[PDB]
Amino acid sequence: WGWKEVVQNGQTIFSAGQKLGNMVGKIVPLPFG
């Protein structure tokens, strides 16, 4: 039993939304622009 440890499993997937959504929503410049 470990509530504090149980949360780590729920956040590990939540916080991932950042790394898994950083390069996605990230826009890049155009060639010779």
UniProtKB/TrEMBL annotation:
Domain of life: Bacteria
Keywords, alphabetical: Plasmid
Protein name: Bacteriocin
Annotated organism of origin: Carnobacterium maltaromaticum
